[PDB]
């Protein structure tokens, strides 16, 4: 009869991290220092008129809509340890 | 008869982190220093008129609608330990 | 009967990190120092008119919509250890 000692330390990380971002989009970021006119899909006798006069001390600084998609998995100071002080395995079979 | 000692320390992380962001969108961020005119899908004799006069000391700083999608899984100072002080496994089979 | 001692320290990292970003888009970032006119898919007798006069001290600094997609998996100070102080394996079979 032999004395068996077994110690095991496993760590499996089955990780799947994804970050998808689709956009079917029209027009989006349109910016005009003076007048801006937008006409989406006019039909038949669709009269659209804009009038504007003079253009003086104008500041126009559009900061816009930032889109951000993220997906993180983080392990900070993870530890899987096994401290076996003073191990001994004696077999004595006369 | 052999003395068996077994120690096991496992840690399985079956993780799935996702972050999806779709947008089917029209027009979105439209900015005009003077007049802005938008006409979506006019039909038949749809008269639309805008008039504006003069343009002086104008500031126009549109900060807009930021979109953010996130998905985190974090493990801070995780610990799976097994402290076995002074282990001993003796077999004595005359 | 022989005394067996076994120590195992495994660490499996089955990782899958992805970051997809599609965009079927029209027009997007359009910027005009004076007037901006956009007409999407006009049909039939779709009269669209814009008028503007004069263009003075104009600043026009469009900061726009930054899109960012990210996906991180990070392991900071990960540790899978096995400290076996003073190991001994004696076999005594007269």
From Swiss-Prot, chains A, B, C:
N6-acetyllysine found at: 11, 20, 28, 41, 47, 51, 61, 73, 77
Chain spans, region Microtubule-binding domain: 1-94
Modified how: Phosphorylation at serine and threonine residues in S-P or T-P motifs by proline-directed protein kinases (PDPK1, CDK1, CDK5, GSK3, MAPK) (only 2-3 sites per protein in interphase, seven-fold increase in mitosis, and in the form associated with paired helical filaments (PHF-tau)), and at serine residues in K-X-G-S motifs by MAP/microtubule affinity-regulating kinase (MARK1, MARK2, MARK3 or MARK4), causing detachment from microtubules, and their disassembly. Phosphorylation decreases with age.
Glycosylation sites: 10-11, 77, 83
In-chain residues carrying the UniProt-annotated modification Deamidated asparagine: 9
Sites of the Glycyl lysine isopeptide (Lys-Gly) (interchain with G-Cter in ubiquitin) crosslink: 11, 28, 41, 47, 51, 61, 73, 77, 83
Disulfide bond positions: 21-52
Tissue: Expressed in neurons. Isoform PNS-tau is expressed in the peripheral nervous system while the others are expressed in the central nervous system.
Annotated positions of the Omega-N-methylarginine modification: 79
Modified residues (N6,N6-dimethyllysine): 41
Domain of life: Eukaryota
Comment block on domains: The tau/MAP repeat binds to tubulin. Type I isoforms contain 3 repeats while type II isoforms contain 4 repeats.
Biological function: Promotes microtubule assembly and stability, and might be involved in the establishment and maintenance of neuronal polarity. The C-terminus binds axonal microtubules while the N-terminus binds neural plasma membrane components, suggesting that tau functions as a linker protein between both. Axonal polarity is predetermined by TAU/MAPT localization (in the neuronal cell) in the domain of the cell body defined by the centrosome. The short isoforms allow plasticity of the cytoskeleton whereas the longer isoforms may preferentially play a role in its stabilization.
Subunit organization: Interacts with MARK1, MARK2, MARK3 and MARK4. Interacts with PSMC2 through SQSTM1. Interacts with SQSTM1 when polyubiquitinated. Interacts with FKBP4. Binds to CSNK1D. Interacts with SGK1. Interacts with PIN1. Interacts with LRRK2. Interacts with LRP1, leading to endocytosis; this interaction is reduced in the presence of LRPAP1/RAP.
Listed name of the protein: Microtubule-associated protein tau
Residues represented out of the complete protein: 588 to 681 of 758
């Amino acid at each position: 009869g032999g004395g068996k000692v077994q110690i095991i330390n496993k760590k499996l990380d089955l990780s799947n991290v994804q970050s998808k971002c689709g956009s079917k989009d029209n027009i989006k970021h349109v910016s005009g220092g003076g007048s801006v006119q937008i006409v989406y899909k006019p039909v038949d006798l669709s009269k659209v008129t804009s009038k504007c006069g003079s253009l003086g001390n104008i500041h126009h600084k559009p900061g816009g809509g930032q889109v951000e998609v993220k997906s993180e998995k983080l392990d900070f100071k993870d530890r899987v340890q096994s401290k076996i002080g003073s191990l001994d395995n004696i077999t004595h079979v006369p």
